[PDB]
Design a protein around this nucleic acid. Structure first.
Lengths: 206, 151, 262
RNA sequence: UACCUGGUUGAUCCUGCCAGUAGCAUAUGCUUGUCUCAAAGAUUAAGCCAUGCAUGUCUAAGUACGCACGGCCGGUACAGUGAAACUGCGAAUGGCUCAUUAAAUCAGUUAUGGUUCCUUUGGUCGCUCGACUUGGAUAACUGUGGUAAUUCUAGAGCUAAUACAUGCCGACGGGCGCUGACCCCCUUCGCGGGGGGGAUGCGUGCAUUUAUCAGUGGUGACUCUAGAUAACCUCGGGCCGAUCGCACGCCCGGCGGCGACGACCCAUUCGAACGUCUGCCCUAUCAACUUUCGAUGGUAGUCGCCGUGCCUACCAUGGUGACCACGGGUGACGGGGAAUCAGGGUUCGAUUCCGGAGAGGGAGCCUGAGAAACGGCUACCACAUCCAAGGAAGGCAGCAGGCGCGCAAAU
RNA sequence: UUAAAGUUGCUGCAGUUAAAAAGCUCGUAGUUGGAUCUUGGGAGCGGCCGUCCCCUGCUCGGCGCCGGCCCGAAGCGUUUACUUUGAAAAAAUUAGAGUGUUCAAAGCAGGCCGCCUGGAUACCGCAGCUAGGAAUAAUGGAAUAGGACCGCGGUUCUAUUUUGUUG
RNA sequence: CGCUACUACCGAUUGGAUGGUUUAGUGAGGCCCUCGGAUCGGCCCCGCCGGGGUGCCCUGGCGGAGCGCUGA
């Protein structure tokens, strides 16, 4: 019975308006999704026009973007760290649009060694043990090595992104509404976004 | 001067993190500015071109369109932020007594920070938009100064 | 009203449906189709009032689903089908065809045509669309989606379509110096030549149309149907050629006809 | 037809009111021969109802083993009609009333470049690179039962789909992009460089979502349509036909004509919905009103078909007002219109066409494209029916009719 | 309930004595506000005058010709009220055209011997959109010259048609 | 001042009643979420056969489900 009318409330002059007709069916409201984390549960509700909107209650993975060289991979949600709207909504593990979370760094790393052939992560004191990448390094011709060399002539990124890559988690943002389409898409935070939201987290946690 | 609140302010048309060859100087750190011609014979000003303010309801750098009616009014009060109230003085006619009466219907319009050379009494024109607030429906297209104020 | 209306009162009908008062409470509400409710004409209205082939509402139904009437090359079995501007209607057995053109007044008129002219139909393009795999599309004033048009068809042109294949044969470009007529408003059925076309940004773009005898009038952009390229019309015009005789000349013509008839 | 007459005085001239005069629509009284139209329980009671009716529906094309009927050579399947019942569609239209409602409704004018749309119409429906027809449940039916009682129903035995489901072959041999073992040509001796073939492996289109780049067609103007790259593609899951009938068949088992039904998307039709400008009766013995119980605006979200304090968390103190806000009253539904009328006006508009609101009055909801539906459902109170006293069943401001209320309104 | 009511008076009432100028004055909102800005002329008809034409500037082209003229136009021109035209403004109803329902209220019919028709028009207060004029009433140009105009002198960002093919 | 009638007014009875706003507390029913799992299906062993194929699979059941999986 949650309404979305514009006649329960006062006017511009401050005088009360008297309602003349009751609550209609196009005027409808529904309770909040409160999209948590966990094993994935998605419910469907019938809306006006007979269409369906996917209510994402819990979810595991997301399809994020990393725009420095335009790659997108399916990535697991790890933990939510910041929400610009409510400070309670970080204490309860909730997902909203334009929210600030941490995602795992493995598939972007695998794409980085598989495309640019430079090591990402792999902190000093422990080198590449399971012997897969130098197998791909070998048995090449001269033209293909020239093509990789001209590609990795410029292979620089931000140092904060590198520090997140040794840390194993990338700070990410959600650009999709999970209570309407049922998925959690978005893009990873880069550039001035990283320093701004890191300043916000270090100010709040202090 | 910018980035005041708890979220980042950006224009969702451009990409602000393009990867250059060097990421040093001499070609970087001048971000592009999104703007469009609103039409109806109106000309976009330079402050919307070279400015650094961020809006989502500005008619020039924003996601709002101009269609419908074009009105005019006189600026009365500048107290609430990023939006102003104008006064429209008009004459009403009575058939019985063949004599006019003046009436006023003040209403709130939106002022972007592009027009910051606005004082009380300046004549402005507005254009109809989608509802941007509870009582705000119009966006200011241009500003015209009143008499005096030669400084 | 919790849903769409399904009835239509007799005095709420449009005037160009051209009915009476003391016959019945209701009027034939047409089925939804290519044309609007206030701009079309039901098949029952035509067959029961204009051609006088039927007298009741059951005789029209018998003739309609007897498979005797063909609508733009397709047989229709709906008694309230919307028939509008230049809807070619054909009777196959007695060999008659009618073209629906607005006459000198604000109404429709019966106009028998030859079958060779009944094979095609002039219609107005409304908007230009681009499909999925880069296919240009045309939306026609009677909702005919045509794939792959001529590249020189613009927003307010007129195309001629054969009723057997659905393709474009020839077209008329929107320009001054072309024969035009108006569909709707105070002016209706007058045939004239476009002279001026005033552009107003953000509102209706009015035009100026001059008659063949010296009269001029102004209508909106949506109230335009281009029918000819120059002076020769591409279709057979009705009687009077759409000249809009005023009340004095109409009275003089009626008095002359009464005196000559005796 | 732009009009007057009697009454204050012993008599006169005036202000002034009373009473005459005319129409109009409610009642009542007296009277009444013909014919043609025509309002009619609205005022006081949006008070209460016994009874009967008002929403159902089959074609040459969804399902027919009821002999309920009927054709025959019965024996490779139905001549055909078919109540019943499953399925699908409509009941959200129409009809009645004026209780609420005073910038609310509504009227003229705009906009959806800020969204959904049953049906019809037109387009798309071998664009995707990976079975000569599958499964089990229920009707109708048979048989057997309970309750005083309802358009109430449980266990038992079969059986169908255009009901519920699971799903393939072809198109389909090669195209477009990444990875590419490798191979070949040369001044430059090779080295270094330039140019062509590429097996193998992965992804492929439309519908949704995110991120990046360029700028076929259009607008006064897009974060518009189209194009490219990288992915997503919900187990309550997008489509890409396991459907039906008529007329007959050509060419060596393959292959054909016209329809009916269903379907993702796109436009159109019917619209609906939210907004822009202007316009409503009286009252100051209502002069200030609203304001962390959102009042005004900004940021970011939730929800909603979409914009928006519609709602959340944080900020600033804003917003209206003597040009009458606010508060109260209304014997207030609004308009097109009606009566009178020289010229201006005054009064009415419950009432046949348009829009809005409700079905005792608030509240909540299933189904469905469209309902906060009441001749749909669920609880409260007022009122009320039947009964073996355990329970069961309803809302005539629909058509007739009855009571109450009345000056006042029919089969 | 309307006219009569010029007994609600905007057209259109009264205020010395018949009903009625606040005891007087200042004063905000309201209402109302002086003069003053382009006059006068020409080609001609009817014979000085009632009707005819003339006294805003600039980037592209079709009605005509021999880099040179006129015509037009993508695009701009101090804003209001008032005034005239144009669009749209549902029907019925109000005026109103036609028509022997035997007349009329009606109704949209009907008339010739298969043929010919009608089923118009006006009105629709105001507000929104447009196109000729600026008489009427109100605003503004420059006085601290941050006034026009003319050709010069310094500081910056960007366009493919070019310094022999290509970097 | 004396008499009759009527109209409203003040007023003890802090009289009676019909509508509305509201402090605080209770709150049926529906809706959403988290749980809950009565009941109903399908595959692998024991028992009988008729096997082509050259002691073993396709074919049909109940008693224990082995409370194993999975769906409503």
């Amino acid at each position: 019975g949650i309404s979305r009318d514009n006649w329960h409330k006062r006017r511009k002059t401050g005088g009360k308006r008297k309602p003349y007709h009751k609550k209609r069916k196009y005027e409808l409201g529904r309770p909040a999704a409160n999209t948590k984390i966990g094993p994935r549960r998605i419910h469907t509700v019938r809306v006006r026009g007979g269409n369906k909107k996917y209510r994402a209650l819990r979810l595991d993975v997301g399809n994020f973007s990393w725009g420095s060289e335009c790659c997108t991979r399916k990535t697991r949600i790890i933990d939510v760290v910041y929400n610009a709207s409510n400070n309670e909504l970080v204490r309860t593990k909730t997902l909203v649009k334009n929210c600030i979370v941490l995602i795992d760094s493995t598939p972007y790393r695998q794409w980085y060694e598989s495309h640019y052939a430079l090591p990402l992560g792999r902190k000093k004191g422990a080198k590449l043990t399971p012997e897969e990448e130098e197998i791909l390094n070998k048995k090449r011709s001269k033209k293909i090595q020239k093509k990789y060399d001209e590609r990795k002539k410029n292979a620089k990124i931000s140092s904060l992104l590198e520090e997140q890559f040794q840390q194993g988690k990338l700070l990410a943002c959600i650009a999709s509404r999970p209570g309407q389409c049922g998925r959690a898409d978005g893009y990873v935070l880069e550039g001035k976004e990283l320093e701004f939201y890191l300043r916000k987290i270090k100010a709040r946690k202090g | 001067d910018i980035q005041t609140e708890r979220a980042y302010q950006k224009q969702p048309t451009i990409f602000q993190n393009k990867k250059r060859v060097l990421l040093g100087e001499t070609g970087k750190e001048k971000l592009p500015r999104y703007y469009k011609n609103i039409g109806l014979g109106f000309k976009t000003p330079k402050e919307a071109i070279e400015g650094t303010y961020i809006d989502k309801k500005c008619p020039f750098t924003g996601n709002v369109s101009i269609r419908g009616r074009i009105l005019s009014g006189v600026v009365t009060k500048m107290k609430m932020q990023r939006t102003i109230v104008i006064r429209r003085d008009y004459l009403h006619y009575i058939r019985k007594y063949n004599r006019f009466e003046k009436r006023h219907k003040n209403m709130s319009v939106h002022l972007s920070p592009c027009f910051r050379d606005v004082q009380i009494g300046d004549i402005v024109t507005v254009g109809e938009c989608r509802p941007l607030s509870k009582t705000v429906r119009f966006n200011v297209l241009k500003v015209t100064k009143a008499a005096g104020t030669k400084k | 009203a919790r849903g769409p209306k399904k009835h239509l009162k007799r005095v709420a009908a449009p005037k160009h449906w051209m009915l009476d008062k003391l016959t019945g409470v209701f009027a034939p509400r047409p089925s939804t189709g290519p044309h609007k409710l206030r701009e079309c004409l039901p098949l029952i209205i035509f067959l029961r009032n204009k051609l006088k082939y039927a007298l009741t509402g059951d005789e029209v139904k018998k003739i309609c689903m007897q498979r005797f009437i063909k609508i733009d090359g397709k047989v229709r079995a709906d008694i309230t089908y919307p028939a509008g501007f230049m809807d070619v209607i054909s009777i196959d057995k007695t060999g008659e065809n009618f073209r629906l053109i607005y006459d000198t007044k604000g109404r429709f008129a019966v106009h028998r045509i030859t079958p060779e002219e009944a094979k095609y139909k002039l219609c107005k393009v409304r908007k230009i669309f681009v499909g999925t795999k880069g296919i240009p599309h045309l939306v026609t004033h009677d909702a005919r989606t045509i794939r792959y048009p001529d590249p020189l068809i613009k927003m307010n042109d007129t195309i001629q379509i054969d009723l057997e294949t659905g393709k474009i044969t020839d077209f008329i470009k929107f320009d001054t110096g072309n024969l035009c007529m108006v569909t709707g408003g105070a002016n209706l059925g007058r045939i004239g030549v476009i002279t001026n076309r005033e552009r107003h940004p953000g509102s209706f773009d009015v035009v100026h149309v001059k008659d063949a005898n010296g009269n001029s009038f102004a209508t909106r952009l949506s109230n335009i149907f281009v029918i000819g390229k120059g002076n020769k019309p591409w279709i057979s015009l009705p009687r009077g050629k759409g000249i809009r005789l005023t009340i004095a000349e109409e009275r003089d013509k009626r008095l002359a006809a009464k005196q000559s008839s005796g």
